[PDB]
Nucleic acid binder design. Structure first.
Ligand SMILES: N[C@@H]1[C@H]2CN(c3nc4c(cc3F)c(=O)c(C(=O)O)cn4-c3ccc(F)cc3F)C[C@@H]12
Ligand SMILES: N[C@@H]1[C@H]2CN(c3nc4c(cc3F)c(=O)c(C(=O)O)cn4-c3ccc(F)cc3F)C[C@@H]12
Ligand SMILES: [Mg+2]
Ligand SMILES: [Mg+2]
Lengths: 191, 485, 472, 197
DNA sequence: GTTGTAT
DNA sequence: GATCATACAAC
DNA sequence: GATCATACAACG
DNA sequence: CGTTGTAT
């Protein structure tokens, strides 16, 4: 456990210094952050609000990527580094849970965060540090449902074929629009 | 750590989450419905306003009140997103035919943002009422709201082709729609034309519907793209600002703009000109002053001596947004699926939805007209046998027995029996019968007429045509955008 | 260049403009009514929620739905200004007895703000319903709203001493009020003891009401300030935190996080040794603030004297009584409430009184009609017009206009046998009711008893255990 | 016939819908409250001699604010920048961009307060402008319609304005020291003596 | 600075 | 949606 | 209340 | 890059 008195603006950090049991929850908005922070067990669980929609790194200039405040906050939290400073042996958390809202917009933020993680934090995903919350709200509502280790249900993100993975991201969240609209016309039942 | 942990494939989860957000944006946010030409937020604002009782007849209500009920009963999103969507359909430059009458600062053409919701008040426009006409006669299906404790309409009646008339846009996922506004009367003429002569070709339709009619006016250059868009749903068009050269009181040329292109900010082009004049990218300009008033747009670009206004004019057309291009991408939701429809396909889609609305209404009117006459038949026989009726009642202990006897004695249904039991004593006067007879007789006529309309498809079309003529007769405008070659 | 210009002195416009904003902020914004202990905003939110139908029994409604109405009908201000007030009425650390039941993120004791109105829904509190009891029986006066298109109550019934129970605050113009919360039961005891022995003293009142009872608990050192406060209406008190080094309860209006941040700053300034650690192990049910060779008692004593672990509360009981702001004492506040409570009961009793008598009058006519249903039908059936039919019935059976109308609007299914005996049963019961309500208005002693009895009912249903332990 | 021609740097505040003319003897500077009213003013103001400068929120009480805080205030800075008069040891009344400074605050009680905060600033740090008879107060018959705001309060052919004139500077200095002074007792005693509930 | 209704 | 200044009294 | 970045397609 | 319009 930490001792405090040390030194992001947001991100309610826990009280432990063991990146083997500690967990970081990436939730969307401060509206969700308050509910999650008011019942997270301030010991091995820290929360970090992602304000607005995360930048699609699969279509953004690397200059804009390094400029995004939101990505800078997430990387600053993990303490892994970036690119050449990628040190997975220095991650401040062994459990990065993505907790987006149940609505479609939350689902979109899940895909964005996944692309960001898969592209510039692959050593994390390759090590199985990334999870996805499985919500079925008050403080005890989120705690006794999704934030309690004794209960709850997690979704360990695991990649099978990197080639298929690299293709999926490029197809869906890539620059080429035509290949995307085709996938919509193919795998989608409306009526 | 955790106990029950599952495993999710990255490629699997990503495709699922994206496919969800994809369809969600397509058929439930971005693109509009081909029938009423409305998107979810626009339809919920209109319907929400209808229930709020803010019709053209009634007074205005605070904007916060309108978005408060729409967001709390129909549209499950941010308050601002609803207010902005409302303010836009109250601006003469944004909507070819406004659907919202506002009171207060609703923004300006110069990109000014409307005042906060705690200042502006709005209500339905006179024409917007046509979008809701006969909404309560079961002409549109309804569905549960997001909260599953309120009922909203999937579509609206829409007694005027709102899609072609107000246009659409546009940004979704994997796709994007872009439809230009049209003149009301012209669009209605197009509808009527396609109804009387099914073998009408695109050219024949363009005879009554020449092309786009933007709210600001301006000019259209090249009609080749116009025919291409109507026949394929896709096409490119050139939009140019209406201008004219004046001579100053000193004796030098004066470039005057009066009608910029659609969705073009005057101030934005004003800043763009100074940025080009002070950059030496365009020389010959003496001054660029905006003399536009609250009664006309006047953007003057005076030229110095020994400098051609025409040379500077075309340069502004080719370097500024004073002359842009409109990318026809007539995409709309039809049969739950997004489709790129042509002009005939959009019209035929409106005429069909128009036929269904009229039939549903005729049925509803018929079903209610007869249901009333049935009761009138009961109340009549009751008023004929008031004594024996009053005797059966008073001699009864329970209403169930009293009703049962009336049904058996006078041969009346359960509904007719209750109607007699609920009769006020004031209905037992002498002049009360002749009144009920006059009403009943009128019901017989209406039921006969409505029975015929549902029996003859020829009448339903004629009813649509006649009703359309009334819409145009009351709301149609004169053409603003001059199409030229 | 103007055509019709006028001259206005600088001093004249300054004095006029300032007095306009002063009185408007004093008697209609910052200060609460000594009656219902509410400010214009809170009173509008309650009545707003009431009209919208977000009662404790009914389901919640989105805040945007509530704020949307309270703004467009009563409170002509901002969304944030209203929604911020509503959120305060739903926080257990804000109000000793909450007036709002909200679902979702409504902030924390760490200073965390509430969520957007698009995520949180709410409704009236159970005890909050007491504030609106018999609001539909002409118990309170109504006025037109800012738009002049709606009507709102100038004050709620308030079946419990809201002012002394929840408190009041605060900042106005040229003046500022500050009233601490009290126990619901303790306050109700004071109101009754006052109704019993008007010759009571300040010391006597403090026998049933020791002092404040803040929703955070903690402790109040000293009692001399509590006496001067209840007597003069002004005074000071010291609030200490409950510790055991772990802090369990912080004083009123004190942020645990802020105290934590200030403790870290004081630790990195050599202004206090021993500070090995200072964590915050507070849960969703328990709050724990954890703070060799340091004695602790010397460091802890310094933390309370330097930080915010021990704050001072300044009594300044200011409220609006009779349109004017006055520095009231405890007795003055109780009298102002007891009188308001008497006005409502009387008003309510008169309302039931007038309604029952009116019902009996129309009931008398119906019986007269049912007894002569044969001729009544004969008169109506031979009637030329409804106007003539009413005139004849009034002349024949000697009935009033209302009674005659009540007969003409009689459904045939009411002309049965068992119907007559049913009306007599209802009628005979009303005579006892009207006779009962008459005695209540004729005897002031009963109105006082009705208030007491209905108060003990509130104390029995909503009163809690004392949270703040007083010390010396 | 003097005027402008755009293209100029100006370096004026981000807001401030400055007019077209450049003659500080006909032009008017409207200090409105918030962009809600500013937009209604900016649109329909005769963009030739009437400039709209939106003030956001309540202006700092100079009587209770340190000079280090006054020089840091952005709203006040945007006001002195619009006039182009100068500050303190640079205040030149003979260099003001506007000879007509029209205070146009909301018709609500709060508008009367912001109106009070302005007059103190205009009397404490822009005295020469007031003594020259430039500061006027609009007399509206507010977030009104475009044609409404002009036809009622902005059109000089029908509008009714009031010229702020100073009688006794002694009584003036005392009024500000009492109403907006750091003293609360004298202010509370004033409100208690000059208020009819 | 901090408290809470306001711009 | 989060964040930014400010009046107003009183510690 | 004013502002601030971003997804998304298409034309610039 | 910027802009369009519903969304976070
Ligand atoms: N670092 C980035 C923050 C978020 N940004 C904006 N956010 C807006 C808005 C505008 C923004 F610039 C909105 O306009 C809005 C709304 O509901 O209208 C919600 N939000 C909004 C704010 C926070 C959030 F988590 C989600 C949202 F949709 C920009 C800077
Ligand atoms: N230079 C200062 C501007 C104004 N600031 C704030 N304004 C807020 C608010 C908060 C502010 F920091 C609000 O919170 C608010 C509301 O209605 O809740 C309205 N407003 C508000 C904004 C603009 C305006 F004209 C009037 C207002 F009341 C900060 C900078
Ligand atoms: Mg927004
Ligand atoms: Mg605010």
């Amino acid at each position: 456990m930490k001792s405090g008195l040390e030194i992001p603006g947001k991100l309610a950090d826990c009280s432990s210094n063991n990146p083997a049991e500690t967990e970081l929850f990436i939730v969307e908005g401060d509206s969700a952050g308050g509910s999650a922070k008011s019942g997270r067990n301030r010991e091995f669980q820290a929360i970090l609000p992602i304000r607005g929609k995360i930048l699609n790194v699969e279509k953004a200039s690397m200059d804009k990527i390094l400029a995004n405040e939101e990505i800078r906050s997430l990387f600053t939290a993990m303490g892994t580094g970036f690119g050449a400073e990628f040190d997975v042996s220095k991650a401040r958390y062994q459990k990065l849970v993505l907790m987006t809202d149940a609505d479609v917009d939350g689902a979109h933020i899940r895909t964005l965060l996944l692309t960001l993680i898969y592209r510039y934090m692959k050593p994390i995903l390759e090590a199985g540090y990334v999870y996805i919350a499985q919500p079925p709200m008050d403080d005890h509502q989120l705690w006794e449902t999704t934030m309690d280790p004794e209960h709850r249900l997690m979704a360990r993100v695991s990649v099978d074929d990197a080639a298929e993975a690299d293709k999926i991201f490029d197809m869906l969240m890539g620059d080429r629009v035509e290949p995307r609209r085709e996938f919509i016309e193919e795998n989608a039942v409306y009526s | 750590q955790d106990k029950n942990l599952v495993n999710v494939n990255l490629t699997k989860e990503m495709k699922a989450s994206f496919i969800d957000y994809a369809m969600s944006v397509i058929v439930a946010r971005a693109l509009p419905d081909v029938r009423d030409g409305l998107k979810p937020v626009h339809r919920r604002i209109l319907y929400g306003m209808n229930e709020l009782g803010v019709t053209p007849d009634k007074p205005h209500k605070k904007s916060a009140r309108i978005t408060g009920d729409v967001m709390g009963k129909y549209h499950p999103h941010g308050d601002s997103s609803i207010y902005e969507a409302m303010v836009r359909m109250a601006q003469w430059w944004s909507y070819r035919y406004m659907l919202v009458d506002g009171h207060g600062n609703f923004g300006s053409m110069d990109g000014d943002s409307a005042a906060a919701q705690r200042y502006t008040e709005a209500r339905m426009s006179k024409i917007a009422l046509e979008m809701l006409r006969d909404i309560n006669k079961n002409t549109v299906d309804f569905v549960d709201n997001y909260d599953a404790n309120e009922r909203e309409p999937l579509v609206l009646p829409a007694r005027f082709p709102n899609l072609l008339v107000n246009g659409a846009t546009g940004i979704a996922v994997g796709m994007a729609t872009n439809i230009p506004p049209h003149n009301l009367g012209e669009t209605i003429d197009a509808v009527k034309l396609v109804m009387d002569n099914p073998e009408v070709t695109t050219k024949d339709l363009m005879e009554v519907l020449p092309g786009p009619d933007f709210p600001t006016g301006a000019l259209v250059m090249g009609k080749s793209g116009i025919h291409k868009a109507y026949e394929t749903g896709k096409g490119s068009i050139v939009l140019r600002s209406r201008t004219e050269i004046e001579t100053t009181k000193t004796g030098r040329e004066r470039i005057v703009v009066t009608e910029f292109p659609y969705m073009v900010n005057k101030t934005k082009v004003h800043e763009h000109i100074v940025r080009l004049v002070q950059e030496k990218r365009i020389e010959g300009i003496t001054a660029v002053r905006d003399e536009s008033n609250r009664e006309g747009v006047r953007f003057v670009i005076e030229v110095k001596r020994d400098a051609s206004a025409n040379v500077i004019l075309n340069n502004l057309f080719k370097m500024t947004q004073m002359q842009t291009n409109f990318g026809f991408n007539m995409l709309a939701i039809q049969n739950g699926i997004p489709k790129i429809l042509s002009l005939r396909q959009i019209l035929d889609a409106y005429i069909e939805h128009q036929k269904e609305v009229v039939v549903r209404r005729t049925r509803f009117d018929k079903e209610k007209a007869e249901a009333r006459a049935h009761i009138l038949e009961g109340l009549l026989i009751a008023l004929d046998h008031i004594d024996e009726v009053i005797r059966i009642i008073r001699a009864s202990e329970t209403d169930a027995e009293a009703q049962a006897e009336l049904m058996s004695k006078f041969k009346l249904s359960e509904r007719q029996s209750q109607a007699i039991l609920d009769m006020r004593l004031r209905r037992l006067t002498g002049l009360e019968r002749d009144k009920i007879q006059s009403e009943y007789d009128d019901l017989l006529a209406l039921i006969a007429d409505l029975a015929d309309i549902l029996a003859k498809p020829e009448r339903v079309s004629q009813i649509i045509k006649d009703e359309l003529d009334e819409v145009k007769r009351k709301f149609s405008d004169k053409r603003r955008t001059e199409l030229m070659v």
